[PDB]
Structures are given as C-alpha cells and as structure tokens.
Amino acid sequence: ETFYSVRMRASMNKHISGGERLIPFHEMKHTVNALLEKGLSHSRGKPDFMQIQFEEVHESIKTIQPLPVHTNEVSCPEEGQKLARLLLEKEGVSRDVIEKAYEQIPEWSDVRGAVLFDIHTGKRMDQTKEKGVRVSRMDWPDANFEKWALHSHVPAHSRIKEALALASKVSRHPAVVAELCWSDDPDYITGYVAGKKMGYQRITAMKEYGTEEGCRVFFIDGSNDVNTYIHDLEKQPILIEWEED
Numbered sequence: 001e002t003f004y005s006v007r008m009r010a011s012m013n014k015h016i017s018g019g020e021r022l023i024p025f026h027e028m029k030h031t032v033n034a035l036l037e038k039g040l041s042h043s044r045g046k047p048d049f050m051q052i053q054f055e056e057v058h059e060s061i062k063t064i065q066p067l068p069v070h071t072n073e074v075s076c077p078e079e080g081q082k083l084a085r086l087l088l089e090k091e092g093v094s095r096d097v098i099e100k101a102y103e104q105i106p107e108w109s110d111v112r113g114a115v116l117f118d119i120h121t122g123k124r125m126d127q128t129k130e131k132g133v134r135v136s137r138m139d140w141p142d143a144n145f146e147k148w149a150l151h152s153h154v155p156a157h158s159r160i161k162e163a164l165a166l167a168s169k170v171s172r173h174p175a176v177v178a179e180l181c182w183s184d185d186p187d188y189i190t191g192y193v194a195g196k197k198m199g200y201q202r203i204t205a206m207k208e209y210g211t212e213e214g215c216r217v218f219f220i221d222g223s224n225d226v227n228t229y230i231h232d233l234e235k236q237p238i239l240i241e242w243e244e245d
C-alpha cells in the first residue's frame with residue numbers, strides 16, 4: 001500500500017526518452033525493466049546516458065478521472081496549429097499571449113521538460129532554462145486505461161495513456177489555464193491542447209513527419225510564486241481511474 005515514484009531519463013551526448021510511474025513496491029522489477037526497455041529502443045536513437053530512480057512517496061494519493069477527450073481530424077500541421085491557437089483562446093488564453101509563446105517555442109525545442117508561461121508577464125515564468133519543469137508522480141493502471149480506450153474508441157497506446165495522465169494532472173492545478181503539446185518524436189505528429197473546459201483535445205497533425213522539434217507549455221494564471229507551482233507539479237501524487245457514466 002506504500003507507493004513509489006519511478007522515473008527514467010535517457011539522452012544522447014539531445015534528449016531521447018523519459019518515463020514517470022507511480023506504483024506499489026511489488027511491481028518494482030517489472031516497472032524498472034519496462035522503463036529500461038523503453039529507453040533503449042526509441043526512434044530518436046539509442047542513448048549513451050540513462051538514469052532510473054525510485055523513491056517512496058509520503059504524500060497521500062489522489063485518484064481522478066481523465067480529462068474528457070475529443071479528436072480533431074486535420075489535413076496538415078498548419079491547420080492543426082491554427083486550430084490549437086483557436087482552442088487556447090477558447091480556453092481563456094489571450095491571443096497576444098499565445099503569439100508571444102509561439103515566438104518562443106522554437107527556442108524551447110531543447111528544453112527537457114515543460115515550459116511555464118505566465119499570462120501576466122507574457123513571458124516564460126519558470127527559471128529551469130534547458131532543464132524544463134518535470135511533471136511527476138502520476139500514472140494510470142493499464143487495465144483501467146485499456147477499458148477507457150475501448151469505450152472511447154481511442155487506440156490503447158501507452159504514449160496516449162502517459163500524455164493524458166500528465167495532462168489530467170496538470171489541468172487540475174488551479175493556476176493552469178491550458179497546456180499545448182506535441183511530440184519531439186519524428187514519427188508521431190499528433191498533439192493536443194488541454195484545458196479545464198475543453199478537456200483533452202487531440203489534433204491529428206501538429207508538425208511534419210521527420211521533424212524533431214516538439215513542445216510542451218503550460219499557461220499559468222496564478223497568484224503564487226513559480227516555485228510553489230513547480231513543487232506542486234513535481235510532488236502531487238495522482239492516479240487516474242476512469243469510471244464510465
């Protein structure tokens with residue numbers, strides 16, 4: 001009944017891969033191996049550095065539902081991004097703060113973690129630079145997740161499970177207005193915008209095949225210092241359990 005946070009990072013020289021898991025002890029070997037195997041064979045390359053790490057969690061665990069999901073079919077990245085910018089505005093980010101974020105996204109391609117963007121300053125809020133803010137201690141039991149996929153008619157890919165767990169944890173934070181995300185994997189072009197009102201909005205094309213610039217940005221409207229928020233994001237333990245209605 002004690003849970004452990006289990007984290008993996010892998011890189012070349014370029015970031016490669018990562019994983020966050022939240023598990024009971026008896027699943028340690030299976031989890032550590034799954035994270036290992038995940039790091040070794042990624043399409044961004046085989047890594048020359050990897051770290052795997054576990055710690056007992058002392059905070060109590062909150063179980064939540066996943067964000068509601070809707071999938072937007074688009075014909076091209078440019079259409080995808082336009083729709084994304086529209087949905088961020090719909091969720092409450094001002095056009096002008098959106099534009100400033102997009103001016104910076106190319107420079108964030110190297111950040112190994114999430115970027116926090118303050119809607120009050122129109123500027124990046126966190127001071128982690130290339131490290132990025134790390135969202136952790138969230139997970140989604142597979143069996144529950146596969147039932148969710150079957151009902152939702154969405155493919156039971158672990159990377160959707162991971163992304164929707166992160167997005168659901170993150171959107172629950174009262175200071176987070178929206179998240180904008182697409183992959184750094186050259187072979188996966190689907191991304192999303194996520195928010196409290198629109199839920200998890202998948203957008204089937206957010207970049208071209210073969211490009212490696214991805215993005216993850218949280219738009220922050222809060223009254224607290226950024227370190228508090230960084231601490232919430234790292235420390236609040238979250239499990240996703242879906243229940244049909």
Ligand SMILES: O=C(O)CCCCCC(=O)O
Binds near residue numbers: 160182185190191202
């Ligand atoms: O909703 C999806 O299809 C998952 C998109 C998230 C991509 C993040 C990644 O795997 O790099």
